[PDB]
Amino acid sequence: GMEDFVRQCFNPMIVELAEKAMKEYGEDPKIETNKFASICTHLEVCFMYSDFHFIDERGESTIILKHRFEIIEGRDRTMAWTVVNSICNTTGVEK
Amino acid sequence: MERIKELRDLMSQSRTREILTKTTVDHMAIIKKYTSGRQEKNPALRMKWMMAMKYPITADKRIMEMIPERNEQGQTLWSKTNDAGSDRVMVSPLAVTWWNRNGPTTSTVHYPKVYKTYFEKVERLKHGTFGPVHFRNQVKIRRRVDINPGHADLSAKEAQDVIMEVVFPNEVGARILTSESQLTITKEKKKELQDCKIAPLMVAYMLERELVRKTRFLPVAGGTSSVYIEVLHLTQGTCWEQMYTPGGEVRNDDVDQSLIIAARNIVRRATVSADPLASLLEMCHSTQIGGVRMVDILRQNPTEEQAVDICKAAMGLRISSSFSFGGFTFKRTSGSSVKREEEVLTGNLQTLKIRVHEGYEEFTMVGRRATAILRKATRRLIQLIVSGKDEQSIAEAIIVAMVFSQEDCMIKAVRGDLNFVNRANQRLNPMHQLLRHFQKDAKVLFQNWGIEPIDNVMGMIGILPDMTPSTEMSLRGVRVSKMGVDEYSSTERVVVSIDRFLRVRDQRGNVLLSPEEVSETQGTEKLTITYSSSMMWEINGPESVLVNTYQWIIRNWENVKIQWSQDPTMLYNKMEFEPFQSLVPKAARGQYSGFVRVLFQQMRDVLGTFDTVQIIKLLPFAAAPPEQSRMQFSSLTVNVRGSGMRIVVRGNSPVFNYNKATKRLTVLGKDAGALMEDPDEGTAGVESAVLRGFLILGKENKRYGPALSINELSNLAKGEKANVLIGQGDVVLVMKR
Amino acid sequence: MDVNPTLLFLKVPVQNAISTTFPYTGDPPYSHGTGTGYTMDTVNRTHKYSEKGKWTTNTETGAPQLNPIDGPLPEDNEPSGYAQTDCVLEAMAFLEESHPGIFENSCLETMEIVQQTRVDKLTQGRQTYDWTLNRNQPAATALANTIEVFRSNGLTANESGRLIDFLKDVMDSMDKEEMEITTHFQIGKKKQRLNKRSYLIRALTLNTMTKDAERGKLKRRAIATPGMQIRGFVYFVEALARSICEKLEQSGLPVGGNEKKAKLANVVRKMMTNSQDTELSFTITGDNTKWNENQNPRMFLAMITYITRNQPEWFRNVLSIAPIMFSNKMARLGKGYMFESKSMKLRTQVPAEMLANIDLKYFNKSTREKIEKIRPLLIDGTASLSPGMMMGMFNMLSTVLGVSILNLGQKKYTKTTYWWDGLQSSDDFALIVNAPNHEGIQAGVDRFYRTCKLVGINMSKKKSYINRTGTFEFTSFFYRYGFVANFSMELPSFGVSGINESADMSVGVTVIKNNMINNDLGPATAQMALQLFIKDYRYTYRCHRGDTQIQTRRAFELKKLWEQTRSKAGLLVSDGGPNLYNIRNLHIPEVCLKWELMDEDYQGRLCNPMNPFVSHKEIDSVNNAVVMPSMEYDAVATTHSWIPKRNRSILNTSQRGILEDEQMYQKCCNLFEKFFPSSSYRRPVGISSMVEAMVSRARIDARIDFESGRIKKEEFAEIMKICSTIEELRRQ
RNA sequence: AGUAGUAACAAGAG
RNA sequence: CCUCUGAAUAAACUAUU
RNA sequence: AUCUAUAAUAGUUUUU
Ligand SMILES: *O[C@H]1[C@@H](O)[C@H](n2cnc3c(N)ncnc32)O[C@@H]1COP(=O)(O)OP(=O)(O)OP(=O)(O)OC[C@H]1O[C@@H](n2c[n+](C)c3c(=O)[nH]c(N)nc32)[C@H](O)[C@@H]1O
């Protein structure tokens, strides 16, 4: 019954991202329903954390340009690690 | 900008959009191999068929804009017909040879850098030195050698990770280069490849050719180094050996390994001599390692090994009473030991032999990043003090000390699927296997080692099986300190005296090294070893020694037979049998000698019984000082590659087998030659050189009752005939002299 | 004086001249027509070996099935497949007893392999029976078609990229009431609907054909090709079997070449040393008659069940599926037959789907008997073949079974004065038997024979023999106190490979070198082999020396190049140059060998990256650094690394449109390499679609470049706009 | 006719 | 008459890349 | 001292 609520509550984009994340490692959304909801909640929290932020030319965060946050969740591990490696190379931050 | 525009253009179309949308990255690999089918089953026949066609080759459409449709004589070079399943056109080999003679010229100056390995092969061949060709009895052994040396301290996966990091920084995924060697090599290659202008894929392939190590099983003789394996077809043959030295630079580790092997062989063969010191000196002066005289290497090479130290002491050079184990330099300050072969049962239900050293001893261990003082007894670690840099170094030192102690707790801690044989069923060193097993993960070892309260003396910190600094209880016998280094004195070569029997002594007069302390392992050399003497097989491996000893006996059978008949005392003292005597187990040598000699005496007392094969088989065993006894031997053992191979007194054996149909002798599968029949051979089916005090009369005789074992022949008396179960399932009637 | 070569064996031992007994200089035999006769013979013979078994009807497919397990014990020496389950279980149990922990560690390693393996592993291989087309297709093509059909039928677990998810898809498809596929004709697309039983029959079907170019056989034989559904399960089972075999000394697999010879020699010498010095030792060179037609899938199921005890249930199920699918297998009959009318002088093709209800007046006596015997087993154009392993499958599991029977020979199990050990490789074996006297040898041989009979293994009496230990034959290796060289076996490798000029030169020289190293090819014979190879090379590629007058279409260009060149030795043999190879430099590439002898202009023309005979990259505009093409036996690419044409038969069929598709695929793949440079070097792994990954990479690269100052803000804005446009196109 | 040998070729298709 | 076309089994190993 | 990394291509071995 949890799956119906999850599909009816969150927007289709987050549902697609969570379903893809589970399918990546063999998880079955229909069998594992609590994990489905947990992933959807985590993705929604991350997207709400990142969205509605921008950096002006000066370099100070602002709300309403370029995004202040780069999102790493919601991607397959390959693209996530590609983004992490590119950021580390271009900034020198610890990996 | 071009990439995104092209992606948008493809996505505009329907079929391309469907392919790009329905296909994941995983299925991209599947569709990449997608094809209508490569209907080729006989490439050679197909090539012969196609070369008769007008236009068998395929070329890009650009060729139509670069090469004329016809040459001077009007011969067509290409046509406009496309290749099915593509857009390339058909062309003739005339086009290729026209381009090679009239095409635009470029600058091919960086090719030697891209293909540095092959030009390095060319340079090594160019500057090589050729010696003479020697015809001999080659004994090639199937072993794992290296065909691509790659980098010294790297593996395949590490090399691939380094290549990815250097060439594809953003495609490395989650890997992090943790090993010091990987990081150093990555930095060095990035510095070298800084501001490179070659395509990334070709740079990756270059780094693969340079760094990745490749090994294969091959039948080898001589050296197993990469430089000596590339020209293996030239230097070694079925019956000949070509002396050759590569023209490049030689690695130091290979020289050290070859020197260790040569020193061990020389010392082992010298121990069995009547004057070991002179024999050792001459052997050292008559030996070369990779084209370099051994004495030069002994002068300019700082190797810590027992046999090398004995050679140096014989040459009057200062030595170090140190050896290597687990990456640490051990040095016995006090105590003494004797080696003993002990059978043990492994934790994972495996039975194996180990060379246990008895007695109490004290050592100092020095490592690149750790140091310790150890005190141990027979299979018992009395105490260890470690003063490493960080937790990892101390843990490694502790593991090495635990394995070095030969503790039963250590043996019983073996878990998982640990094997003590090679993938080709060749024995491995038990200690090295234990070290490799426990270095990956020593949690069980530490858990089963034990704990003990400490006395809190001098402030030296403790250590727990979890590798933490405790102060109340610590690992049994192990302590952690900080002020213990004593590393300068390790490299303190001391002047020593060497006895006639190769017993190295200090200036004070204490014994430091003796031949008994040299390893009994029979390894192979990285660089080819050349020996110049009457017997070029004097310091060879066991199989070569056996085959050449029997071949020498066969070749000189005339004078050897005369000498055996007339003056046996001088025959047994030939210098040719000493390499063979080195293979016989020491504790048995005298015994065997005695036995064999008695047989020969009987063979001379009873006329008409002169079997050439028996004398040839048993002659090498009579070269040791005899020890009288009444024991009966049905076979005599010889140590070959760590296994005791038996030679049966009567009949053929796996080692020594004689074939009467061809009158040929085979030793370990190698043809030692054909015996020449003598008129004095006894053609009566009587054997007098099988039993110590008995004469074999004939086949089974049921008159004298059932047969009895060989060891139960001591109950008979003079003139009593009996049936004996002597031989491989054979019963024969014999009588007692 | 009549010349009798065989009499040479009166002085040279047969092994030392064994190479003379291989007539491998003539062409090998081939099969001409159909393979239906051989397939029918194989099916009938397999059922005859199990005739006394239990007949049942499969409730899912309806096909008759024969079960010989736990059948009557044989009363004679004819081949039989009445294996006893308890005996097989006991053999496995004693094998576990002798090597504690073998099955546990094997299962651990196999669990890791199963959890890690990717679906692309199935693209390996040459051909595969495609159930959507009822014929063979390239493995990658078959996998692509199956994935497409599954996606069209709502089976998309394979998107995960794991092989086990593909197996889940196969299992779920088994339960579908219907399946829908697409078919091509004269090149339209039509839809076909398969009911549950038809699809199930297709999924359990293995195609059959006749093997060509096999040495040493007077008569032809049949071979099989598995379908798409069963490849993954067989792969996992064989991974488990390989793990088990790696831990056994008697196993002759999966080692080969010099390592295999060394292992066999070490094992044999260890057996010899363990033998007492007062007991007879004999060696049996043996063969097993119809090994694969007597081994039953049910016994393999039992062995797997015993091996995977105390393991997670999912692992046991995924391993057990393969024997389950193999005991319900079907066999395709083949092409059919051909009929001829002499009076009317005409010929016709009769397909194998008509054999069910075709009048038998056309066929001769033998074929008529075959068809009559096999008709009861025919269903949906195939034949029901429950017993037996078809052809060359489960080799390592068979090796495990043979090694277990060998392990049963220890004294702790024989409980008498004789014992045995030896070497096993699939179905070939060498057996060393030790006993105090000859009667002990006889008793040991008889006990080994009967124990093999109990587990359904028949020792070929007419092809097996026994002698004293010291000489034998095993897997075509002749041991005479040590393995001997056999040059004739590798002789067909000498010649011209047929790749291209550079690769063929490299292959020829490397083959000569390797045979010097391995097969005891002497120096003088090596030089003569080099001369013969260069002659064949020149004749094949029309590249005779420029200073000759051989008439060929290529001679004029070579003559001009020869005349215009100053350094002749620098020219390649492909360009009419001389031969500089000898023994000492067989290990060096030809171009590198004579690099320091080439004229600058000729050298530049030869190694010119912009040569249309080798493709060009697209980085920047074109990678104009080195000639770049799959570079096997071709160290340095030159203008002589061209690629020959392709077979154009498909152009006359309905599948020719597929060409377009593959071309288009390449197009897309090319674009993907402009975003992820490492894809060509290393295989990319991911679940996102290609377009999504490319767009994400473009966005991240644009951000990184803009932050680092590599590009200006106008380019960043344009790239973001185009990315948004692509996102819009994705939905529409 | 011939190749060949347990089934085919002695051109096939559009 | 004319157009097109000259035919890729499984496992393991070996060699090269 | 140990030494089964992947993928492509060709060759060899595995019959009542
Ligand atoms: O390649 C082989 C060998 O040549 C090489 N090697 C040896 N020494 C060096 C140095 N100094 N530099 C570079 N390479 C070197 O390492 C390989 C060793 O092969 P192998 O012959 O199998 O090993 P070895 O037979 O020497 O036995 P090993 O286990 O390595 O022991 C080394 C050394 O330690 C002695 N030892 C062990 N134990 C438990 C001892 C003990 O309890 N008490 C005493 N007094 N000595 C002990 C071994 O006997 C050797 O002396």
Ligand SMILES: [Mg+2]
């Ligand atoms: Mg056989």
